[PDB]
């Protein structure tokens, strides 16, 4: 109840953003469309280039976003863009930026798990400098992936099925819904990105304050899905690829309390999944078990493959 209220706040607060720049997207002029596209363009290219191999280029993208969003001008395709005296453009760019951060976790991190970390540090620093952009990141992240709240959408009477399949996060064309394999991968990448945000912090800038969306939200998420009955394939999947990404940082921060949480899913929550899942869809639960058996006897959770190293920050 406490979480669903907070969920609605960010949701209704994102809806207020959809209306605050009303008329900037609803226009038929040639210039009204030229501004909208040029801002939508100069606010998503930097995030698309985050697939990087050196911190030196990753900082170029960070500043390019910070300049564009703070009021300063930025280079786009052909001509330079600005936002001053574009009160709709400022609130409009925070929306398109926040969604592009999630879209990359949806169509890049799903295919390639390593890309979560360079996207997380950049999303974490902008969230730190602009907490409004971060609340918009949680808004889209939450709706596109309600399992990240976490909350399992419920079977609804009185609403159409397509509207309900939309609730579950399934991608739907006008005719039909996407498959499950393409949907489970999209959901994974979205929480691997989120599991990366709550542990990484943008190094440069000298920030006095706390992490914007701290690693505490990682503890509750695990607590909040393990105190509720698991879904057949989703839970065992999302649970694994969350611990692999944030299990190390959670072990260090919560030393024994995390191990207690790990000797519980092995002893209590694993039997919970055996009854609910048919033999046809055990592929997720088996990889959830292989992942622990190592960690439990090794007394350590491996660092996520793709974590940023010192060599990266010098490159």
């Amino acid at each position: 109840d406490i979480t669903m209220q907070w969920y609605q706040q960010l949701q209704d607060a994102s809806m207020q953003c959809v209306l605050t720049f009303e008329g900037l997207t609803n226009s038929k002029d040639s210039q009204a469309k030229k501004i909208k596209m040029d801002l939508q363009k100069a606010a998503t290219i930097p995030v698309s280039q985050i697939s990087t191999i050196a911190g030196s280029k990753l900082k170029e993208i960070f500043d390019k976003i910070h300049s564009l969003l703070s009021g300063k001008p930025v280079q786009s395709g052909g001509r330079s863009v600005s936002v001053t005296l574009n009160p709709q453009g400022l609130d409009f760019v925070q929306y398109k930026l926040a969604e592009k951060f999630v879209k990359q976790g949806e169509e890049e991190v799903a295919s390639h798990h390593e890309a979560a970390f360079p996207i997380a540090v950049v999303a974490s620093g902008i969230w730190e400098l602009h907490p409004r952009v971060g609340d918009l990141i949680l808004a889209h992240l939450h709706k596109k992936c309600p399992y990240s709240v976490p909350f399992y959408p419920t079977f609804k009477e009185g609403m159409a099925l397509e509207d309900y399949q939309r609730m579950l996060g399934y991608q739907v064309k006008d005719s039909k819904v996407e498959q499950q394999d393409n949907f489970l991968k999209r959901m994974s990448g979205m929480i691997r990105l989120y599991a990366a945000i709550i542990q990484l912090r943008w190094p440069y800038g000298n920030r006095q304050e706390i992490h914007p969306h701290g690693l505490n939200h990682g503890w509750r998420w695990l607590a909040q899905i393990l105190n509720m009955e698991p879904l057949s394939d989703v839970t065992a999947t999302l649970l694994f690829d969350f611990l692999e990404v944030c299990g190390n940082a959670l072990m260090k921060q919560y030393q024994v309390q995390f191990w207690k949480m790990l000797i519980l899913i092995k002893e209590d929550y694993f039997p919970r999944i055996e009854a609910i899942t048919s033999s046809g869809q055990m592929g997720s639960f088996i990889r959830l078990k292989q992942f622990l058996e190592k960690c439990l006897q090794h007394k350590d959770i491996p660092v996520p493959k793709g974590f940023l190293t010192s060599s990266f920050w010098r490159s």
């Binding site: 960010l10 609340d135 503890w219 309390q257």
Partner: protein, 45 residues
């Protein structure tokens, strides 16, 4: 900006006795893991 709570370790005080006794046990209880993060005193158990 919307209200969001960001505490890494919840203080031992202000915490419910339910959640306190879960953290102090050698094993958790299924379905009652505390939502708030553990406190600073019990990270060495």
């Amino acid at each position: 900006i919307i209200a969001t709570d960001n505490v890494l370790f919840t203080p031992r005080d202000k915490l419910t006795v339910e959640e306190l006794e879960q953290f102090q046990s050698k094993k958790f209880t299924l379905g009652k893991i505390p939502l708030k993060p553990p406190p600073l005193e019990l990270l060495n158990v």
